[PDB]
Amino acid sequence: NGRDSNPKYLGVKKFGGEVVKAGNILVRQRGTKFKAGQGVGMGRDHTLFALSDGKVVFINKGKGARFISIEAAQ
Amino acid sequence: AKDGPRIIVKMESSAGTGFYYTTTKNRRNTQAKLELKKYDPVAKKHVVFREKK
Amino acid sequence: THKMAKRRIKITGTGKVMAFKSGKRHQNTGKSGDEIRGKGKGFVLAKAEWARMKLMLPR
Amino acid sequence: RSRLIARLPKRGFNNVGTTYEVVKLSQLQDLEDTTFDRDTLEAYRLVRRKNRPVKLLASGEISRAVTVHVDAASAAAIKAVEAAGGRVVLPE
RNA sequence: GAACUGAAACAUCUCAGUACCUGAAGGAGAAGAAAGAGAAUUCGAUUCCGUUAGUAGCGGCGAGCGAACCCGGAUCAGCCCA
RNA sequence: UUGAAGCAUGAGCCGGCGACUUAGACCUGACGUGCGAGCUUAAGUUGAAAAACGGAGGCGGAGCGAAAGCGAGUCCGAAUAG
RNA sequence: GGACCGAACCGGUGCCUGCUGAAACAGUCUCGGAUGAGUUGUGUUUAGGAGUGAAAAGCUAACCGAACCUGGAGAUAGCUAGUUCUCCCCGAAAUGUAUUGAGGUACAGCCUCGGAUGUUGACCAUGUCCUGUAGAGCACUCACAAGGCUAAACCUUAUGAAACUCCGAAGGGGCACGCGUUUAGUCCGGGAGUGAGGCUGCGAGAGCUAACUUCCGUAGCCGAGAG
RNA sequence: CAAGUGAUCUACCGAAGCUAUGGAUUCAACUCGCGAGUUGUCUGGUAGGGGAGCGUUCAGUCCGCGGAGAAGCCAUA
RNA sequence: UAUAGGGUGUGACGCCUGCCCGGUGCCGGAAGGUCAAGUGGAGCGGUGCAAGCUGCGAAAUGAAGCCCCGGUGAACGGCGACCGCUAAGGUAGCGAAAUUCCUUGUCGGGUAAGUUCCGACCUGCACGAAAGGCGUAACGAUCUGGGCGCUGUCUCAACGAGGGACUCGGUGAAAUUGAAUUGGCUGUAAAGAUGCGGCCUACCCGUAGCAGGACGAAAAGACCCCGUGGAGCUUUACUAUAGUCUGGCAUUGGGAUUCGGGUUGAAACUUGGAUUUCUAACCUGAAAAAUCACUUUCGGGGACCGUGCUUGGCGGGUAGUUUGACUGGGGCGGUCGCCUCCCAAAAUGUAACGGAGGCGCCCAAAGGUCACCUCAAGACGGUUGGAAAUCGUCUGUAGAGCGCAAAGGUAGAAGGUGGCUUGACUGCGAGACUGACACGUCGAGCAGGGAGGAAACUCGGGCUUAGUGAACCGGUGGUACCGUGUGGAAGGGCCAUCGAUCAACGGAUAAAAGUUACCCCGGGGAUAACAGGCUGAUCUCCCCCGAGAGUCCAUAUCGGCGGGG
RNA sequence: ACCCCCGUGCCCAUAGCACUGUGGAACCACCCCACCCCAUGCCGAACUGGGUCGUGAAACACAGCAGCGCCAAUGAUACUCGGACCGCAGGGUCCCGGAAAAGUCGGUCAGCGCGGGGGU
Ligand SMILES: [Mg+2]
Ligand SMILES: [Mg+2]
Ligand SMILES: [Mg+2]
Ligand SMILES: [Mg+2]
Ligand SMILES: [Mg+2]
Ligand SMILES: [Mg+2]
Ligand SMILES: [Mg+2]
Ligand SMILES: [Mg+2]
Ligand SMILES: [Mg+2]
Ligand SMILES: [Mg+2]
Ligand SMILES: [Mg+2]
Ligand SMILES: [Mg+2]
Ligand SMILES: [Mg+2]
Ligand SMILES: [Mg+2]
Ligand SMILES: [Mg+2]
Ligand SMILES: [Mg+2]
Ligand SMILES: [Mg+2]
Ligand SMILES: [Mg+2]
Ligand SMILES: [Mg+2]
Ligand SMILES: [Mg+2]
Ligand SMILES: [Mg+2]
Ligand SMILES: [Mg+2]
Ligand SMILES: [Mg+2]
Ligand SMILES: [Mg+2]
Ligand SMILES: [Mg+2]
Ligand SMILES: [Mg+2]
Ligand SMILES: [Mg+2]
Ligand SMILES: [Mg+2]
Ligand SMILES: [Mg+2]
Ligand SMILES: [Mg+2]
Ligand SMILES: [Mg+2]
Ligand SMILES: [Mg+2]
Ligand SMILES: [Mg+2]
Ligand SMILES: [Mg+2]
Ligand SMILES: [Mg+2]
Ligand SMILES: [Mg+2]
Ligand SMILES: [Mg+2]
Ligand SMILES: [Mg+2]
Ligand SMILES: [Mg+2]
Ligand SMILES: [Mg+2]
Ligand SMILES: [Mg+2]
Ligand SMILES: [Mg+2]
Ligand SMILES: [Mg+2]
Ligand SMILES: [Mg+2]
Ligand SMILES: [Mg+2]
Ligand SMILES: [Mg+2]
Ligand SMILES: [Mg+2]
Ligand SMILES: [Mg+2]
Ligand SMILES: [Mg+2]
Ligand SMILES: [Mg+2]
Ligand SMILES: [Mg+2]
Ligand SMILES: [Mg+2]
Ligand SMILES: [Mg+2]
Ligand SMILES: [Mg+2]
Ligand SMILES: [Mg+2]
Ligand SMILES: [Mg+2]
Ligand SMILES: [Mg+2]
Ligand SMILES: [Mg+2]
Ligand SMILES: [Mg+2]
Ligand SMILES: [Mg+2]
Ligand SMILES: [Mg+2]
Ligand SMILES: [Mg+2]
Ligand SMILES: [Mg+2]
Ligand SMILES: [Mg+2]
Ligand SMILES: [Mg+2]
Ligand SMILES: [Mg+2]
Ligand SMILES: [Mg+2]
Ligand SMILES: [Mg+2]
Ligand SMILES: [Mg+2]
Ligand SMILES: [Mg+2]
Ligand SMILES: [Mg+2]
Ligand SMILES: [Mg+2]
Ligand SMILES: [Mg+2]
Ligand SMILES: [Mg+2]
Ligand SMILES: [Mg+2]
Ligand SMILES: [Mg+2]
Ligand SMILES: [Mg+2]
Ligand SMILES: [Mg+2]
Ligand SMILES: [Mg+2]
Ligand SMILES: [Mg+2]
Ligand SMILES: [Mg+2]
Ligand SMILES: [Mg+2]
Ligand SMILES: [Mg+2]
Ligand SMILES: [Mg+2]
Ligand SMILES: [Mg+2]
Ligand SMILES: [Mg+2]
Ligand SMILES: [Mg+2]
Ligand SMILES: [Mg+2]
Ligand SMILES: [Mg+2]
Ligand SMILES: [Mg+2]
Ligand SMILES: [Mg+2]
Ligand SMILES: [Mg+2]
Ligand SMILES: [Mg+2]
Ligand SMILES: [Mg+2]
Ligand SMILES: [Mg+2]
Ligand SMILES: [Mg+2]
Ligand SMILES: [Mg+2]
Ligand SMILES: [Mg+2]
Ligand SMILES: [Mg+2]
Ligand SMILES: [Mg+2]
Ligand SMILES: [Mg+2]
Ligand SMILES: [Mg+2]
Ligand SMILES: [Mg+2]
Ligand SMILES: [Mg+2]
Ligand SMILES: [Mg+2]
Ligand SMILES: [Mg+2]
Ligand SMILES: [Mg+2]
Ligand SMILES: [Mg+2]
Ligand SMILES: [Mg+2]
Ligand SMILES: [Mg+2]
Ligand SMILES: [Mg+2]
Ligand SMILES: [Mg+2]
Ligand SMILES: [Mg+2]
Ligand SMILES: [Mg+2]
Ligand SMILES: [Mg+2]
Ligand SMILES: [Mg+2]
Ligand SMILES: [Mg+2]
Ligand SMILES: [Mg+2]
Ligand SMILES: [Mg+2]
Ligand SMILES: [Mg+2]
Ligand SMILES: [Mg+2]
Ligand SMILES: [Mg+2]
Ligand SMILES: [Mg+2]
Ligand SMILES: [Mg+2]
Ligand SMILES: [Mg+2]
Ligand SMILES: [Mg+2]
Ligand SMILES: [Mg+2]
Ligand SMILES: [Mg+2]
Ligand SMILES: [Mg+2]
Ligand SMILES: [Mg+2]
Ligand SMILES: [Mg+2]
Ligand SMILES: [Mg+2]
Ligand SMILES: [Mg+2]
Ligand SMILES: [Mg+2]
Ligand SMILES: [Mg+2]
Ligand SMILES: [Mg+2]
Ligand SMILES: [Mg+2]
Ligand SMILES: [Mg+2]
Ligand SMILES: [Mg+2]
Ligand SMILES: [Mg+2]
Ligand SMILES: [Mg+2]
Ligand SMILES: [Mg+2]
Ligand SMILES: [Mg+2]
Ligand SMILES: [Mg+2]
Ligand SMILES: [Mg+2]
Ligand SMILES: [Mg+2]
Ligand SMILES: [Mg+2]
Ligand SMILES: [Mg+2]
Ligand SMILES: [Mg+2]
Ligand SMILES: [Mg+2]
Ligand SMILES: [Mg+2]
């Protein structure tokens, strides 16, 4: 049939290496796809956001071991 | 949000008087036992009166 | 115009145009979130070029 | 289709009752002589259209004496009028 | 006492008291001597121009319609009857 | 017009006629000029082989609010967050 | 005698001729009625949502599903045409979104002019993150070839997959750097137009793995490009 | 009897591409007067934007012309 | 002056005219239901110190009308959407008929041969009784079939005549016309070429002729679609309305009777209603005076009617209008918003009348927190209980569950169970995701207050992703800003909320359906029908393999299942 | 310092399972009883609480072991950015770098800390 609906825009907003601010969105994905690490929060929609300004970094080995974290600069 | 003759309802809150409102959606599905809950008005805080009508 | 008079589209010092917030307004609200008491003053100047000549005597 | 204007809420008011001619405080004090503008300076002074009451508001400041007759003024201005010496008077 | 038209359709609304018709009259006519305007216990017959002012307001509060008071001018006369 | 020598439109030929205007104390930009903490008059009056006069009014000069109002502050609110 | 035949007269059945006519409805031949609901002269009456009509929406001054004239009136026209003197500089669009919207409008995108800013643009290289197509492969779900076993399971052997995935590139995307070449970019403000695209190669759907088909993606050209 | 065809090599042909010589626009720079001048650069083009101009009538002003002849008309290298 | 007049349908005459009123209309309908203005006016509120002045305002009472009951079909109508139940289901007569789809129905007649015509039959796609049924002498420039007669209609044309056509003298038009120095074939081009390419042919110019081409001329296609273009018509579309019915109030008065009752058991100033009656208003007719006017003398009607104002109904008789888009032309059908997967080409984004499926909710606990708990399935053994139960042990990266649709996700749980609970909070909102806008999504942290925990802490609904409606206009609770001399109040504003299958889901007005073959305009080859063009599913034809038939033998002929052109 | 035990991290199967052997007054564990703290929607099995003997059986701990799991090359190939092409079409090729999945060769039954108790 002809009934499919809407874009939904899920993604990884700030990729590893990037300098986040406080309140920026790091990932948009569906349930758990990335786990919130050090310095990273998570909302209703999941969707990790930045707790503290700094540099974003990706950490994984396998499975659900994916993690997003922040660290400061100075 | 739409409304009809059917089950559940929209029900307002009590007098935190203050003459005040809350209005959470409710249901007659479980029971007609009415209701009372805790909320805060202009006056004070947590003045807890009964679901109306 | 007479339309934006008691309505939104307020001009400011910089000449920028002030918009209110719509959803929801006096009906069909229900639900939960703050957001009810969260419809305030707002704006964008992209459309606003066309809103100046609609009512400028006042701000 | 349906213009933004119509889509946008308001009721609000109109009114617009009494509105005051502003007299900038920097204008009196410091520059010129701080010459005691009195009640009607008018010409050589900044009020023009009038037929509207005049209010005196604090903007610039220095210590010099002044006597200002206006319809009203800000209390934080009227603070600096006496604290430099001088006064602000209002009608009965 | 119209309609096309406009409101991007159409009924309120707009066109517009316009067009047309009829009646009366003059070189002009109409209007006029406050049971008024108004909010200063102010003005001071009428008409006209500028301005107030796209301001107050009117409106499927839509399209769109839209004053007057103060002030500045042209001209300025009030006289008679129950 | 995606695409025209087109068997798609128009035109027999030559002359002459023939289509982005005008209006407003309107709005908003650019260039130019004169005055610039200010700038400028309208209707009208006077004088016209020519122009002066006329401050009624208009525009800067304070913003914020739904409004009362307050004022380099204002608004939402008990504050501070905005 | 709303009888018969048949002239006058009234009428138009059939064929033809005529078609820039002799004629804006006729001519020859033929035919109908030819004392009746007959033919026709004069004067008169009825008209525009009105008249008349043995009834076709017929007639109402050679074009009547609403006559003519004058006026509102330069009605309105999201439609069709047309828009004239020269050289120079730049230079598009036929996409998105919404629309009583689909050949029309609004906003954004793309063009230009001016001011501000000033290498922030561009390519390419390094570094780092993100991805589930190509291929592959049955470990999940559906499918499925030959057996073994005591019909599902189970074992040997063997396959398919847009809506399967144990895996998984080439490329692509973001950020940093300029380790090195280039020259644009952004903001503010004036003016726009375009919003019907077409073809080919590659990647798909629909189609019949048909179309100078249709609908998206992607590069290049015509579009607006002569040699 | 290849002017068919597979492979290899090399001479020439061939565009408004590149090159030669000359010339003009565009922007940019360098100072000269307080427009010009070499250098480097640019210049296909529809809707559309920007810029500089040609010609017609009228008007003000200036300079003038015309019966030994005005405008208009006709011819031309 | 009902042997009359109006309307309607039928249509000499003859034999006749059935069944069904449920719905619609129409005529007649004392109970009862609803119902307008208007009489009545309990009570609620505003202002003033008050007299009082004022804003709404219901019981009862109030007409015609519909609802409800009965009847009425030479009233609208109905008498096969497989019998389907709906008031009933076809009386005569007719039927392959002007009705018949299949259809050239099947027989028969006529012809050498008959899709027609005639006669039968009947299985009437969709005969039938005043839209009349079936007959009927006569009539017909009516329509259909057949015969005789005669014939140029024909085989098949010939000769002859007159009038044009042609030639000379005279006068002398027209539509049309980018410009032309205007060939054939075969290609190519916007897809039918004199004008492009290659090849061929062709001395210059005329007159009489012919109609293939010049997509020949004529008329900005009348078919088709398009335009938020038009006009005629229609109705149970919308809306008003001429018209008409009805209540109240005037014109418009009197008296008897009765009931309802007030002011001073009757008297009685009376105030109205109902029937009745009178007569001055008013209408109206005869008399020498035709329309009138009158003293009128009169005769009848008469508070009615008519008429002015207002109340409610009826009202295609009339009038203004509405009647969406998408769409491999339009229509019919389907589809419009929202969530999930595939398409989607390993970023996001991405279309088709592409391939599948769901949403317009639920949950007072399926929420908050605090604690503990671990599933599906198999094998063995076990009790009305066996496929499946309940119990036991063993295996048991999930093969389970998560309220619904799928994807992601989940074992240190979001899943299973309890304790206590109201954060499914008021005031804000750093900084980001996403959108042309308008929307939409996430969110640390601050304060006022809480909740669970001993505590770190967590909480401003749910594993997330669907469960929605801008603005306008308005209902309710607050709040006390505005408030037209002032002080109040009516009215308005901000706070919170309720109203929307406005589902054509960015929503046109508060309120809207059809038809045009009588059609008109503005356009479109942006878009159907004819033809061409590209294509070749289908259609036509050929080929390949060879099982089988041909007693025997595939291949004299015929060629299963398949295959290629 | 060494042996080892108890705790607790990092790593986040090349550290996992089964077959199995050592371990016991020092540490862990079972065992012991529990009206009450506390607690099983039935059972103190689980939490919980009072403590020995016993036991090293179970659970745990370490050593063994490469049958299973898990990791897994080099070679070649699939595919592919870019370049250049053949076929009416389905499809195919050449150059250029990039370069999998599976499979084989193999590699393993881990590594790295902090603290405390106990032997030498
Ligand atoms: Mg999607
Ligand atoms: Mg790992
Ligand atoms: Mg303001
Ligand atoms: Mg109209
Ligand atoms: Mg209109
Ligand atoms: Mg009107
Ligand atoms: Mg007149
Ligand atoms: Mg006269
Ligand atoms: Mg005036
Ligand atoms: Mg005056
Ligand atoms: Mg006077
Ligand atoms: Mg075309
Ligand atoms: Mg061409
Ligand atoms: Mg042509
Ligand atoms: Mg055309
Ligand atoms: Mg022509
Ligand atoms: Mg104007
Ligand atoms: Mg002005
Ligand atoms: Mg004016
Ligand atoms: Mg200027
Ligand atoms: Mg100056
Ligand atoms: Mg006769
Ligand atoms: Mg006879
Ligand atoms: Mg006739
Ligand atoms: Mg005749
Ligand atoms: Mg006869
Ligand atoms: Mg009519
Ligand atoms: Mg005539
Ligand atoms: Mg005529
Ligand atoms: Mg007409
Ligand atoms: Mg016109
Ligand atoms: Mg007009
Ligand atoms: Mg129109
Ligand atoms: Mg117009
Ligand atoms: Mg260029
Ligand atoms: Mg949308
Ligand atoms: Mg635009
Ligand atoms: Mg620029
Ligand atoms: Mg400037
Ligand atoms: Mg640089
Ligand atoms: Mg940049
Ligand atoms: Mg850069
Ligand atoms: Mg796949
Ligand atoms: Mg594959
Ligand atoms: Mg997949
Ligand atoms: Mg493997
Ligand atoms: Mg990679
Ligand atoms: Mg602009
Ligand atoms: Mg311009
Ligand atoms: Mg514009
Ligand atoms: Mg469009
Ligand atoms: Mg388009
Ligand atoms: Mg396209
Ligand atoms: Mg297909
Ligand atoms: Mg095509
Ligand atoms: Mg074009
Ligand atoms: Mg070319
Ligand atoms: Mg180009
Ligand atoms: Mg070329
Ligand atoms: Mg060149
Ligand atoms: Mg040169
Ligand atoms: Mg150019
Ligand atoms: Mg001369
Ligand atoms: Mg001249
Ligand atoms: Mg009849
Ligand atoms: Mg009955
Ligand atoms: Mg037959
Ligand atoms: Mg037939
Ligand atoms: Mg026979
Ligand atoms: Mg015959
Ligand atoms: Mg027969
Ligand atoms: Mg025949
Ligand atoms: Mg026939
Ligand atoms: Mg028959
Ligand atoms: Mg009958
Ligand atoms: Mg009948
Ligand atoms: Mg019938
Ligand atoms: Mg009949
Ligand atoms: Mg009959
Ligand atoms: Mg006859
Ligand atoms: Mg005939
Ligand atoms: Mg015959
Ligand atoms: Mg015979
Ligand atoms: Mg002859
Ligand atoms: Mg002859
Ligand atoms: Mg002659
Ligand atoms: Mg001649
Ligand atoms: Mg020739
Ligand atoms: Mg060709
Ligand atoms: Mg051609
Ligand atoms: Mg040809
Ligand atoms: Mg040729
Ligand atoms: Mg040529
Ligand atoms: Mg001819
Ligand atoms: Mg046309
Ligand atoms: Mg016609
Ligand atoms: Mg219409
Ligand atoms: Mg009426
Ligand atoms: Mg009425
Ligand atoms: Mg009508
Ligand atoms: Mg009606
Ligand atoms: Mg359509
Ligand atoms: Mg169709
Ligand atoms: Mg259409
Ligand atoms: Mg469907
Ligand atoms: Mg994607
Ligand atoms: Mg991609
Ligand atoms: Mg697209
Ligand atoms: Mg789609
Ligand atoms: Mg598909
Ligand atoms: Mg849980
Ligand atoms: Mg506690
Ligand atoms: Mg918080
Ligand atoms: Mg209220
Ligand atoms: Mg007042
Ligand atoms: Mg109030
Ligand atoms: Mg919409
Ligand atoms: Mg809409
Ligand atoms: Mg509406
Ligand atoms: Mg509607
Ligand atoms: Mg007909
Ligand atoms: Mg007609
Ligand atoms: Mg037409
Ligand atoms: Mg076409
Ligand atoms: Mg189209
Ligand atoms: Mg179209
Ligand atoms: Mg045809
Ligand atoms: Mg045709
Ligand atoms: Mg065709
Ligand atoms: Mg082809
Ligand atoms: Mg055989
Ligand atoms: Mg054989
Ligand atoms: Mg053979
Ligand atoms: Mg065959
Ligand atoms: Mg074949
Ligand atoms: Mg341990
Ligand atoms: Mg020992
Ligand atoms: Mg025990
Ligand atoms: Mg063991
Ligand atoms: Mg290798
Ligand atoms: Mg290969
Ligand atoms: Mg390639
Ligand atoms: Mg090729
Ligand atoms: Mg290949
Ligand atoms: Mg390469
Ligand atoms: Mg390679
Ligand atoms: Mg490699
Ligand atoms: Mg491998
Ligand atoms: Mg091996
Ligand atoms: Mg071991
Ligand atoms: Mg240690």
Swiss-Prot record, chain A:
Subunit structure: Part of the 50S ribosomal subunit. Contacts protein L18.
Full-sequence range covered: 12 to 85 of 91
Keywords on record: Ribonucleoprotein, Ribosomal protein, RNA-binding, rRNA-binding, tRNA-binding
GO cellular component: cytosolic large ribosomal subunit
The protein's name: Large ribosomal subunit protein bL27
UniProt record, GO biological process: translation
GO MF annotation list: rRNA binding; structural constituent of ribosome; tRNA binding
Organism of this sequence: Deinococcus radiodurans (strain ATCC 13939 / DSM 20539 / JCM 16871 / CCUG 27074 / LMG 4051 / NBRC 15346 / NCIMB 9279 / VKM B-1422 / R1)
Job description of the protein: Binds the 5S and 23S rRNAs and also the tRNA in the P site.
Keyword Disulfide bond included in the entry's annotation: no
UniProt family annotation: Belongs to the bacterial ribosomal protein bL27 family.
Keyword tRNA-binding: yes
Domain of life of the native organism: Bacteria
UniProtKB/Swiss-Prot annotation, chain B:
Assembly notes: Part of the 50S ribosomal subunit. Contacts protein L35.
Gene Ontology MF, one: tRNA binding
PROSITE patterns, per the entry: RIBOSOMAL_L33
Task performed by this protein: Binds the 23S rRNA and the E site tRNA.
InterPro entries, A to Z: Ribosomal_bL33 (IPR001705), Ribosomal_bL33_CS (IPR018264), Ribosomal_bL33_sf (IPR038584), Ribosomal_zn-bd (IPR011332)
Name of the protein in question: Large ribosomal subunit protein bL33
Name of the gene this protein is made from: rpmG
Single GO cellular component term: cytosolic large ribosomal subunit
Keyword Calcium (UniProt): no
Assigned keywords, A-Z: Ribonucleoprotein, Ribosomal protein, RNA-binding, rRNA-binding, tRNA-binding
Any single GO BP term: translation
NCBIfam families: PRK00595.1, rpmG_bact
Pfam families noted in UniProt: Ribosomal_L33
Family listed: Belongs to the bacterial ribosomal protein bL33 family.
Swiss-Prot record, chain C:
GO molecular function: rRNA binding; structural constituent of ribosome
Key words of the record: Ribonucleoprotein, Ribosomal protein, RNA-binding, rRNA-binding
Pfam family, one: Ribosomal_L35p
Gene Ontology CC: one annotated term: cytosolic large ribosomal subunit
Transmembrane segments: none
Domain of life: Bacteria
Gene Ontology biological-process entries: translation
NCBIfam families noted in UniProt: rpmI_bact
Family of this protein: Belongs to the bacterial ribosomal protein bL35 family.
Subunit structure: Part of the 50S ribosomal subunit. Contacts proteins L15 and L33.
Known function: Binds the 23S rRNA.
Name this protein carries in UniProt: Large ribosomal subunit protein bL35
Species this protein is from: Deinococcus radiodurans (strain ATCC 13939 / DSM 20539 / JCM 16871 / CCUG 27074 / LMG 4051 / NBRC 15346 / NCIMB 9279 / VKM B-1422 / R1)
From Swiss-Prot, chain D:
Transmembrane segments: none
GO cellular component: cytosolic large ribosomal subunit
Keyword Manganese set for record: no
Single GO BP term: translation
GO MF annotation terms: rRNA binding; structural constituent of ribosome
UniProt keyword list: Ribonucleoprotein, Ribosomal protein, RNA-binding, rRNA-binding
Subunit structure: Part of the 50S ribosomal subunit. Contacts proteins L4, L21 and L35.
Family as reported in the entry's similarity comment: Belongs to the universal ribosomal protein uL15 family.
Role summary: Binds to the 23S rRNA.
Protein name as it appears in the record: Large ribosomal subunit protein uL15
Gene: rplO
